[PDB]
């Protein structure tokens, strides 16, 4: 009974969507994401899981602000405007 | 070996007391001036079964000395106490069944 018949009883979710990382890893009863560790302040990561670090690091998303910083640094964090 | 049954009890998970239906902890009144120096009279309002416990409990109501209100205590009923009976608690209460001396 442990196999096929028992797979019929699987219709309750142990995990739902995480607000922080978007994965289906928020454990409903522990109120804790198994992937990113929300709502701990720190993001969960381990040096034993390098491949997991690589899936989530800086550069895997949009950057949004951090992509422009090198350009800003190059021009000495200038302030005003270009003259004609 | 594995942790035996008698050691699992202290973690108190499935071994905690089943308290949903209990009336409250049975306890005498707090020992205050009236009880140290005189007596105070309460009424037995109810005599009631407590789940888990053999003995029935007695809901005794006393007036508050310092505020206009009533104060239900929960006593363990002594054999012979009845609803409506007055109970006397304190240094000067008389030697009758149900009184607190």
């Amino acid at each position: 009974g442990k196999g096929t018949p028992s797979f019929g009883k699987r219709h309750n979710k142990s995990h739902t969507l995480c607000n922080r990382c978007g994965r289906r890893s928020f454990h409903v009863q522990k109120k804790t994401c198994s992937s990113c560790g929300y709502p701990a302040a720190k993001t969960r990561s381990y040096n034993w899981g390098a491949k997991a670090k690589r899936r989530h690091t800086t550069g895997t998303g949009r950057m949004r602000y951090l992509k422009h910083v090198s350009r800003r640094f190059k021009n000495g964090f200038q302030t005003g405007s270009a003259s004609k | 070996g594995r942790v035996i049954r008698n050691q699992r009890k202290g973690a108190g998970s499935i071994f905690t007391s089943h308290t949903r239906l209990r009336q409250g902890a049975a306890k005498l009144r707090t020992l205050d001036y009236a009880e140290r120096h005189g007596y105070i009279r309460g009424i037995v309002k109810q005599i009631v079964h407590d789940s888990g416990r053999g003995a029935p409990l007695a809901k005794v109501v006393f007036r508050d000395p310092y505020k206009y209100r009533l104060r239900e205590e929960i006593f363990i009923a002594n054999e012979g106490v009845h609803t409506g009976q007055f109970i006397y608690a304190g240094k000067k209460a008389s030697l009758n069944v149900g009184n607190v001396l």
Binding site: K13, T16, L17, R24 | -
Partner: protein, 50 residues
């Protein structure tokens, strides 16, 4: 699932919009190498896992 959360419904709406074959005119673009929609999903084949 009749009585569903908004968050779940919003994800389902996204999935509705993505469920389409490649627009044909993409194939005509210069240096195009996209042949077909390789991320097409179907309710009978693969579940969304929420």
């Amino acid at each position: 699932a009749a009585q569903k959360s908004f968050r779940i419904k919003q994800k389902m709406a996204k999935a509705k919009k993505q469920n389409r074959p490649l627009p044909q005119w993409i194939r005509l673009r210069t240096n195009n190498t996209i042949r077909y929609n390789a991320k097409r999903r179907n309710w009978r084949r693969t579940k969304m896992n929420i």
